[PDB]
Amino acid sequence: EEIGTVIDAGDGIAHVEGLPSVMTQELLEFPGGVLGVALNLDEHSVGAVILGEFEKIEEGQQVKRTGEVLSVPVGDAFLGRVVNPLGQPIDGQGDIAAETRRALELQAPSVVQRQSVSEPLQTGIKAIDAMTPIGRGQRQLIIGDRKTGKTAVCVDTILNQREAWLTGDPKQQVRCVYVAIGQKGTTIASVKRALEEGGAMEYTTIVAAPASDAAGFKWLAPYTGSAIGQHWMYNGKHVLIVFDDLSKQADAYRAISLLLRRPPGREAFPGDVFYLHSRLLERCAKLSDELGGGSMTGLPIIETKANDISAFIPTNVISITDGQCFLESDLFNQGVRPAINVGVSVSRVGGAAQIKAMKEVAGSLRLDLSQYRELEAFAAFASDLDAASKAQLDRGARLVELLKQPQYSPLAVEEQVVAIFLGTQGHLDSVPVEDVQRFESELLEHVKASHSDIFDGIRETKKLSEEAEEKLVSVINEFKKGFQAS
Amino acid sequence: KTAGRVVRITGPVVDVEFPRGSVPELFNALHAEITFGALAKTLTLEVAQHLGDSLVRCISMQPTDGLVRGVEVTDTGASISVPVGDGVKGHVFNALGDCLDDPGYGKDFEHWSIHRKPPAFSDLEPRTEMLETGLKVVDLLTPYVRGGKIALFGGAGVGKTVLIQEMINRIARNFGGTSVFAGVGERTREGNDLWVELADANVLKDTALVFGQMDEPPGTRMRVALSALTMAEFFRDEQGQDVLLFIDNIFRFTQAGSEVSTLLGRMPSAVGYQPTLADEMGELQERITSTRGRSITSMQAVYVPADDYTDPAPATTFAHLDATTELSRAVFSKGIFPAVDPLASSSTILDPAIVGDEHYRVAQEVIRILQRYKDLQDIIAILGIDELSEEDKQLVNRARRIERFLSQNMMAAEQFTGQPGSTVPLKETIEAFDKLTKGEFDHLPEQAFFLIGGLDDLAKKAESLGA
Amino acid sequence: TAGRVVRITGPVVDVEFPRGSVPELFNALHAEITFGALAKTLTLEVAQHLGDSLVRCISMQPTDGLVRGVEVTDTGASISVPVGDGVKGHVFNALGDCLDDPGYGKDFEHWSIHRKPPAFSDLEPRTEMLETGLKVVDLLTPYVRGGKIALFGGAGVGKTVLIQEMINRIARNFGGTSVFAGVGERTREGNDLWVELADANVLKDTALVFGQMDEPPGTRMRVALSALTMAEFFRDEQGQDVLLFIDNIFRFTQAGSEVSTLLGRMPSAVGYQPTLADEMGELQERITSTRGRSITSMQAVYVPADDYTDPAPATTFAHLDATTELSRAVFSKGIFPAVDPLASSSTILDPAIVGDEHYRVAQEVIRILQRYKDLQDIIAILGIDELSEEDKQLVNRARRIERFLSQNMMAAEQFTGQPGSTVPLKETIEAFDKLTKGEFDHLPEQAFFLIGGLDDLAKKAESLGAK
Amino acid sequence: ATLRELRGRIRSAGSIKKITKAQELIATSRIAKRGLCGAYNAASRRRAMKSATDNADDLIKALTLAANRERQAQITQEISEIVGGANALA
Ligand SMILES: Nc1ncnc2c1ncn2[C@@H]1O[C@H](COP(=O)(O)OP(=O)(O)OP(=O)(O)O)[C@@H](O)[C@H]1O
Ligand SMILES: Nc1ncnc2c1ncn2[C@@H]1O[C@H](COP(=O)(O)OP(=O)(O)OP(=O)(O)O)[C@@H](O)[C@H]1O
Ligand SMILES: Nc1ncnc2c1ncn2[C@@H]1O[C@H](COP(=O)(O)OP(=O)(O)O)[C@@H](O)[C@H]1O
Ligand SMILES: [Mg+2]
Ligand SMILES: [Mg+2]
Ligand SMILES: [Mg+2]
Structure with missing residues (x-):
């Protein structure tokens, strides 16, 4: 029965003497139910990070070693609940019937335990689903200045899984884990309200470490959410985890490391901050069929300042993930919503994360838009543009309008295919730019009402057959005959 | 012993x-x-x-x-504990709860510890209810939230305190509840001025003033905000009062924390700030909140060191707010008051589901025009407007008129100019900026749009200018 | 004991x-x-x-x-790893354990992963072109057989896609052994490469050694040494030509920087370990051909934050015979491979080795592109019409040249949906000679985007209404 | 990347200044004997290009001051990180 003693304490860090057999990363019990984690083990003492309510810690208090590393409860009961980084409910809805427990620091699937990302994870957002497609098992970074719509993209993605959930089929369902790190409490409540209004709490768990929480909780919260999601992933389920946001977790980890007097590096961050994020994000994986074929898709969020993507943490996370959607306030204010900077945003999985029809109608959309932006900048003050350049500019303007999309307005994959088809096949070239949006919507509605077979074919077969394409061209021309261009 | x-x-x-x-x-x-x-x-x-x-x-x-x-x-x-109750209203206190205008007053009151936990998450409810101010720019682009958290960011001397006075005038005067003002690391003579102004306006009897100002040790400048928040929390949780909480300036709380962290022998974080910067801000800010059925409307001035909005202190403050008015040195140099950056400022309730489709559409059009104007500054700085396309020249003239019309003669600006302020109903603001974005005032000269109220003021000023 | x-x-x-x-x-x-x-x-x-x-x-x-x-x-x-012909076709970790068949290679000969580089007297400079079929590489950054090749770039500019492209074009028909070292990169990418090599039937000739970015710093420090030890065995014992691919070598340095202060070393500039250049020198100098024993090595070098002045890439530059430098600016324009023709270099791009015609054409392309870079800001502000006639002609030529340097790659089909192409060096030289003379000035610039040779150019031009 | 962007802007402004000064001198010559003429459409080219050259000079000056502030600040921040690491290892 080893019992240590608090030899000093302060700022959510304690130093404990004794406990000769304590493990690294072991969970420690301080009196009054306070919990800590042993991080620094040296001959003199143990450095411990207190996981909340450290104001009760005192010199001389007895510290008991629980004999277990950081672990959290896991199971289906967590769906629809708000919990803290220890898995403890905070929504006031009673206990959570855990299926089992899971250590936070379990190794990610090996290179031979995986299979290539091949299944789409539809966000419902044309820009993302067409130009930066996300597959199941992918890590797509949502990065941008504040108020650029990062949380909007992630919450819309969670909401867009409602139909898949209603299918009832585990191969189609996606279970969502939303991790709120350092957010104000009312903001988390508003995200929860948005999910509830959209029917997403049926399949969503929130791991919340609000700004009032100890830096230990903010450091742990992504790992807790990851463990919860991994329990489902290793059981054949598909999971989507959102980290909102990893910058705050990096800050919390830096605070902890500096308080433990570990030597600092760039921007005073600890040496292993990149390792923190990389170990976190490599647990998002697409498992091999031998392991059940489950997947966890990561949507980390990074906030930059002054669009400076060359800061330390943004650089780390960009180098970790399978692509990124760069959101920019300049694009946002210009009406480009989602404010995705096409030139520098990319998905490292590509067409494998798209259905065949989408890959067909959007194979070169991102490159075309990058070239269009280049030409628009270059030809800004040209007075005599040639025919080819003028055609490219007009097409690009129509495509940019096509990719604009309001919040809380998901498009089913078949509808996205039809819209991108309108764009890239030249059917918008006769429509005035300012009408494109309206045209698109109207056209889709029309197809929805009298030609739902096109949507049904795209949905069932994941393809646009030649006959269906001819029918769609005919329907588009007939609709154009009557469309009223303001 | x-x-x-x-x-x-x-x-x-x-x-x-x-x-x-x-x-x-x-x-x-x-x-x-x-x-x-x-x-x-x-x-x-x-x-x-x-x-x-x-x-x-x-x-x-x-x-x-x-x-x-x-x-x-x-x-x-x-x-540390401070007096709480109805009696703190009408009186000035320091960070320890001592009454300055009447030493010994409040010693018999109930006393509350200045340290406490924030409300439980289950009690938190998002607030989406516009707090109309009558300021064109705020109402249109960064609508304030009743029971929400508003911050006014800005560098030195760009108008944070004058705008706090403006919002005390517009919101606190007609307030049916209690007001708490926290002077944190600001000018002592400004505290005296506020005390006297509130006395003159008869708002003092409803207001508790707590001051730990510049000439204080960093510990007092770190704790005075907690003391004022403790009084505000008493009003919120024990009386069901709607509470107005004004803090000037919360950056000073962060700065005092940095000084103290250095004195405590902690290893510095980036830019020399305390490692616990975000943690300390989180504790304080999370206490400053409304709860289900219990309203605190909080307005905070936030200093921006060296006009560096990337500085860690304001950077961590941004996350704690429902509405953010960012004052710009560039806007200030133009003589535009309030010196708001209309592109950098934001509000969580400026979305169509809350403010309605027309308000949102007009705001988005104004923002698009201003953003386009900003994008063209590279060319204009060198060549002027004469090289732009016809569409861009039209947009630039529109944007100059819009940016001027976002200015307003404020109630609190009279002291500096002798001109009484104006109040613009939100509906008139929406209509006026709709007409502006549509080009219905493109013929009026630019100065007609400068430091005025609604459309009648614009008509009168343009007439005075000959247009 | x-x-x-x-x-x-x-x-x-x-x-x-x-x-x-x-x-x-x-x-x-x-x-x-x-x-x-x-x-x-x-x-x-x-x-x-x-x-x-x-x-x-x-x-x-x-x-x-x-x-x-x-x-x-x-x-x-x-730490010692298995060596021999048996490591071919198998995937190992930095410690020598076989991942695809655990326990495999236990009985092989084992070699320590720490080794001195070849003696100076055994070193012979390599000047022999390794034709790839990629226009930009073969024209402006010609690779060297038995030499050291690096792909520099910031995050996500195409280093890995180009590495896979080079495995496709060079390793598929290689008559020797290939060693791929995944140094601190994505596990998904390792699984993809493993499957792709098995599909191409190149795996039987390839030894894969993986230490992923999710491993602790020690593994990321030593995995490169393990792979290099296997390659050194093939170079010095089996005496066959070896292909060595490393992605990403910067991770080695980064891993060393992650434990530097924990090892008690005072940090150097930009947060790097003081021993940066020395550890890099040990490792890189082991990656070399010796007289009669060839290692063609291709290294992906991550450039932190796109900053080519960063000490890690700056120190790496001295170790290469050819460098293809990828640029975010080029990437964002949609030009793939995102090669910066002005910044990239090769030690065999001189008339003596590549011949007068190749050298002349490459120099002319570089001169035109440099002039276009110089003129870009003017074109942005004052517009193209204010250029002289010769400068307008040069700008049109440069836009076509920069587009024609882009190419549809075999490894990129997963992203574009377009199958790749291969261009012979003679055709590349002739095409760019014609381009620099303005023989294609009449074709739309969009005709030159992401194609192969002159036949692809003609076909795309006819698709665009030109000829 | 701030300093790199500022230096790129300084180079751009310098080139613009050179071109506008050349154009102003050419316009001077043409006076004795396109749309870069100031408010003419809304001699004039000479005045407009003199104005543009002065504006580019002012822009270069301001950008150079900003670049020097950034250069000094980067030196100071780098030293701060180096000395912080050294102190923590003291
Ligand atoms: N597609 C969209 N169309 C229109 N408005 C949008 C869209 N996406 C987001 N918004 C609005 O933009 C604002 C920013 O959204 P959001 O909160 O998701 O951004 P953020 O980058 O996560 O912000 P923060 O820095 O506050 O966390 C909100 O008003 C949101 O309603
Ligand atoms: N609306 C206004 N109209 C006219 N003058 C104004 C206005 N607002 C501010 N000023 C002028 O600017 C000065 C500074 O304003 P204010 O004190 O509100 O700035 P601040 O941002 O709080 O400054 P500091 O950082 O020094 O505390 C005022 O004293 C007055 O001179
Ligand atoms: N040749 C190419 N053609 C089209 N897209 C490309 C090409 N090369 C890279 N990309 C896009 O850019 C992304 C980055 O490629 P990758 O090599 O993984 O980046 P890094 O340079 O970081 O290794 C790819 O996933 C792909 O989407
Ligand atoms: Mg957000
Ligand atoms: Mg002030
Ligand atoms: Mg890569």
Whole structure:
């Protein structure tokens, strides 16, 4: 029965003497139910990070070693609940019937335990689903200045899984884990309200470490959410985890490391901050069929300042993930919503994360838009543009309008295919730019009402057959005959 | 025993040795005496760390000049506590709860510890209810939230305090509830001016003023906000009052924390700030909130060091807010008051589902025009407007008129200009900016749009200018 | 005569041994983690002799669950990996364990992963072009058979896609052995490469060694040495031509920087370890052809934050025979491969080796592109019409040249949906000679985007209404 | 990347200044004997290009001051990180 003693304490860090057999990363019990984690083990003492309510810690208090590393409860009961980084409910809805427990620091699937990302994870957002497609098992970074719509993209993605959930089929369902790190409490409540209004709490768990929480909780919260999601992933389920946001977790980890007097590096961050994020994000994986074929898709969020993507943490996370959607306030204010900077945003999985029809109608959309932006900048003050350049500019303007999309307005994959088809096949070239949006919507509605077979074919077969394409061209021309261009 | 003794003094930080078994708890208030004549006083120390070997490190609320090693330190057994109740209204307090306008007042009141947990997450409810101000720019682009958190960011001398006075005038005067003002690390003469102005406007009887200003040790400048928030929390949780909480300036709380962290021997974070910057801001801000059925409308001024909006202090403050008015030095240089950056400012309720489709559409059009105008500044700086396309020239003239019309003659600006302020109904603001974006005033000269109220003011000013 | 763990801080472990049994530097030691969930055998590498029979070591696996005072065993040797023809077709980790068939290679000959580089007198400069079929590479950054090639770039500019392209074009028909070292990169990418090599039937000739970015710093430090030891065995013992691919070598340096301060080293500029250049020199100088023994090595070099002045890429530049430098600016324009023709270089691009015609055409392309870069800001502000006639002609030519340097790659079809192409060097030289003379000035610039040779150009031009 | 962007802007402004000064001198010559003529459409080219050259000079000056502030600040921040690491290892 080893019992240590608090030899000093302060700022959510304690130093404990004794406990000769304590493990690294072991969970420690301080009196009054306070919990800590042993991080620094040296001959003199143990450095411990207190996981909340450290104001009760005192010199001389007895510290008991629980004999277990950081672990959290896991199971289906967590769906629809708000919990803290220890898995403890905070929504006031009673206990959570855990299926089992899971250590936070379990190794990610090996290179031979995986299979290539091949299944789409539809966000419902044309820009993302067409130009930066996300597959199941992918890590797509949502990065941008504040108020650029990062949380909007992630919450819309969670909401867009409602139909898949209603299918009832585990191969189609996606279970969502939303991790709120350092957010104000009312903001988390508003995200929860948005999910509830959209029917997403049926399949969503929130791991919340609000700004009032100890830096230990903010450091742990992504790992807790990851463990919860991994329990489902290793059981054949598909999971989507959102980290909102990893910058705050990096800050919390830096605070902890500096308080433990570990030597600092760039921007005073600890040496292993990149390792923190990389170990976190490599647990998002697409498992091999031998392991059940489950997947966890990561949507980390990074906030930059002054669009400076060359800061330390943004650089780390960009180098970790399978692509990124760069959101920019300049694009946002210009009406480009989602404010995705096409030139520098990319998905490292590509067409494998798209259905065949989408890959067909959007194979070169991102490159075309990058070239269009280049030409628009270059030809800004040209007075005599040639025919080819003028055609490219007009097409690009129509495509940019096509990719604009309001919040809380998901498009089913078949509808996205039809819209991108309108764009890239030249059917918008006769429509005035300012009408494109309206045209698109109207056209889709029309197809929805009298030609739902096109949507049904795209949905069932994941393809646009030649006959269906001819029918769609005919329907588009007939609709154009009557469309009223303001 | 039970009594400690000073072992180390390093500025406003004191190390105190206590007997075994009598080490005070974190945040306990201890008392020491300085006897040297001119500086004689009772120091209130706040336990900040347990150093080991029965030593504690404490932050002094008063300057430690004249303190001697070995003097006796007594543990009150509790943290700093301030008077609460209806009686704090109409009175000025320091960070310790002492009444300055009437020494000894409030000693018999109920006393609340200044440290406490924020509301439980289950009690938090998002607030989406516009708090109309009558300021065109705020109402259109950054609508304030009733029961929400508003911040006014800005560099030195760009108008944060004048805008706080404006919002006290527009919101506190007609307020049916209680008001709390926290002067944090700001000018003492500004505190005196506010006290006198509130007395003149008869708003003082409804207002509790708490001041820990510039000429204070960093501990007091760190704790005064908590003391004022404790009074506000009493009003919110014990009386069901709607509470207005004004803080000027919360950056000073962060800066005092940085000074103290340096004095406590902690390893610095980026830009020399305390490692616990985000944690401290989180504790304070999370306490500053409404709860289900209990409203606190909080407005905070946030200084921006060296006009650097990337500085860690404002950067961590941004996340805690429902509405953010960013004052710009560039806008200020144009003479535009309030010196709001219409592109950088934001509001969580500026979305169509809350403010309606027309308000949202007009705001988005204004923002698009201003953004386009900003994008063209590279060309304009060199060549002027004469090289742009016809569409861009039209947009630039529109944008100049819009940016001028976002200015307003404020109620609190009379003292500087002698011109009485104006109040613009939100509906008139929406209509006026719709017409502006549509080009219905493209013929009027630019100056007609400068520092005025609604459309009648624009008509009168343009007529005075000949248009 | 075993040691015991004294201190544990992240991936660095202090171990005390009996006097006279201190393990030699770089020796591998074994320690047990017995906690059931994390139970494993840690391999520690001795980094320093701290004195008093204490050694500081770097763990190869995560130290979570490790306990102070547990037994540490000295293997008496450095980390060693299996070598021989048997490593072909199999996937290993930095420690030599086979991932695809655990236990495989246990009985092979084993070689320490720490080794001195070849002697200077054994070094022979390599000047022989390695034709790839990529227009930009073959024209402006010609690769060297048996030489050192690097792809520099910021995050996500196409280093990995180009590495896979070079595995496709060079390794598929290689008559020797290939070694791929995944150094601190994505596990998904490793699985993709493994499957793709199996599909291409190139795996049977390829040894894969993976240490992923999710591994502790020690593994990311040593995986490159392990792969390089396998390659060195093929170079010096089997005496066959070897292809060595490393993605990403910067991770090596980064891993070394992650443990530097934990090892007690004062940081150098930009947060790097003081030993940056020296450790890089050891490793890189081992990656070389010797007289009669060829290693063609291709290294992806991450450029932090796109900053080519960063000490890591700046120090790496001195180790290469050819450098293809990828640019974010080029990437964002949609030009793939995102090669910066002005910044890239090759030591065999001179008339003596590549011939007068190739050198002349390459120099003319560089001159035109440099002039276009110089004129870009003017075109942005004042517009193209204010250029002289010759400058307008040069700008049109340069836009076509920069587009024609882009190419549809075999490895890119997963992204574009377009199948790749290969262009012979003679055709590339002739096409760019014609382009620099303005022979294609009449075709739309969009005709030159992401195509192969002149036949592709003609077809795309006719698709665009030109000819 | 701030300093790199500022230096790119300084180069751009310098080139613009050179071109506008050349154009102003050419316009001077043409006076004795397109749309870069200031408010003419809304001699004039000479005045407009003199104005543009002065504006580019002012822009270069301001950008150079900003670049020097950034250069000094980067030196100071780098030293701060280096000395912080050294102190923590003290
Ligand atoms: N597609 C969209 N169309 C229109 N408005 C949008 C869209 N996406 C987001 N918004 C609005 O933009 C604002 C920013 O959204 P959001 O909160 O998701 O951004 P953020 O980058 O996560 O912000 P923060 O820095 O506050 O966390 C909100 O008003 C949101 O309603
Ligand atoms: N609306 C206004 N109309 C006219 N003058 C104004 C207005 N607002 C501010 N000023 C002028 O600017 C000065 C500074 O304003 P204010 O004190 O509100 O700035 P601040 O941002 O709080 O400054 P500081 O950082 O110094 O505390 C005012 O004293 C007055 O001179
Ligand atoms: N040749 C190419 N053609 C089209 N897209 C490309 C090409 N090369 C890269 N990309 C896009 O850019 C992304 C980055 O490629 P990758 O090589 O993984 O980046 P890095 O340079 O970081 O290794 C790819 O996933 C792909 O989407
Ligand atoms: Mg957000
Ligand atoms: Mg002020
Ligand atoms: Mg890569």
